[PDB]
Amino acid sequence: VGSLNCIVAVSQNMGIGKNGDLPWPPLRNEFRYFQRMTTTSSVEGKQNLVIMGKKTWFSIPEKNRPLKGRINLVLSRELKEPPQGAHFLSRSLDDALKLTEQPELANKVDMVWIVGGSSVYKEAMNHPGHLKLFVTRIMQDFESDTFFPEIDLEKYKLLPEYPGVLSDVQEEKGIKYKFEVYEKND
Template sequence: MSFFKCLTLTTKDKEKQNAVVMGRKTWFSIPEKHRPLAGRINIVLSRELKELPGAHHLVPSFQEVVQLLKEPSLVKKIEKIFVIGGSSLYKEAIDSSYCSKIYLTRIDHDFQCDAFFPELDTNKYLLIRDAEVLQEEQEENGIKYRYEVYKRHAQL
């Protein structure tokens, strides 16, 4: 979580913030005392909800997220945009032409779960070395993991 927080909070331009885009279930998975995620513009996608106290923006579709983020008032405030879940939003973003980079934590352990990160198309994305991201294997509470960074081929 500390890497996620640092990555999504840090900006080069101190006058700007990063945006975090998430689905409704991801929003509600964040403990209420931490919503909205501080220091970031929180955008929630939900086809069902008509209002969501605490979220900076609530939109019904990925295309409307894209349109919102093109608004001049937001363009001048936002440095980077991070899609932070859930799985269907990840897939839609990764399959779109808007996704340029993927920060992935690969966990070397099996867990019982019901949501999965989509398979990455290696014809579209290439694993790269990123100087800002420690990519050596790490361990926490006996669980090994590593950070991986992928970049869209067309941008290499």
């Protein structure tokens, strides 16, 4: 099993969600970036795994789930089996990370990508170890009911460049945004 990473898009006011959807109008190319980064494995014969909370799973349009070309794992303590279309269900983040190391998935899983929401991000971000955050900075305020946790810059270093990640300002639907990659190792 390869690297552990979080990926998020976030507004200036740290918003990630509103009413079970994104706070901003759909950004097609941002979604294409998310798909590209999470799907692409750097190892032959292997697949990346995505971990998400229950509400995140149901926020994804049915036509886009499961997230194609990746193993889809949902976190829930209420569910008794994986949701329709999903591949796996775990009851904690630790339990999910162990499952990747079982004979089942040990040699099929390359990268692990936590794709939301807040509580999964928080726990991952504050757990000791090697972790990268792929953060899309939406450069406006958007009314939100769900927020990204604090990035501690004492631990997380913003990388000055990263292969496959554009460094200039993007714009869709009159909304500017930029891609960032952070790395910690503790």
